[PDB]
Amino acid sequence: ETLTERNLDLEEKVRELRETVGDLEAMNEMNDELQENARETELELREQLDLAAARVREAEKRVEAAQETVADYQQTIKKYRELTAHLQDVNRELMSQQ
Amino acid sequence: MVETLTERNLDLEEKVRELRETVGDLEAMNEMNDELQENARETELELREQLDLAAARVREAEKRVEAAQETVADYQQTIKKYRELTAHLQDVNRELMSQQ
Secondary structure (H helix, E strand, O other), X not given: XXXXXXXXXXXXXXXXXXXXXXXXXHHHHHHHHHHHHHHHHHHHHHHHHHHHHHHHHHHHHHHHHHHHHHHHHHHHHHHHHHHHHHHHHHHHHHHHHO | OOOHHHHHHHHHHHHHHHHHHHHHHHHXXXXXXXXXXXXXXXXXXXXXXXXXHHHHHHHHHHXXXXXXXXXXXXXXXXXXXXXXXXXXXXXXXXXXXXXX
């Protein structure tokens, strides 16, 4: 009769555990779905990041180009102003010789 | 049946052992996911940072470009004028030289 008390006690514990396993499974299942979506969102980001990383010196090169092109012009100017001076000196000197 | 019934009891003691183990594994699996979720969230955030940094770097450089492009146009004009002038002086000097 006792063995029966102990036996019924156990049939409960099984029912209890089966329920708990069901919940754990379900919870784990649900998280897996989220984790799936997280993995794809990341993969998306990584793609967007590579596009931007490209755009960044596609641009930081364009900047260098221009910055060089200006320095070139400052030199070209610096030279024209030397030249013009020089031609003025010559002209002036020619005029006095008249 | 205190012989045929201890059989039933022994049967059950196994089922609990089996289930306890299973739960253990489920717990550990769950734990594992928690670790993944934390890494995911931090890696996602790290990326979002990196994206904003780049987006900034781009806009900034693209305006540095625009600055120069303006500065250059100014210089082209200044040059265009010096070139005209230079011509003009040459014409005047050449013509003066022939007259002596």
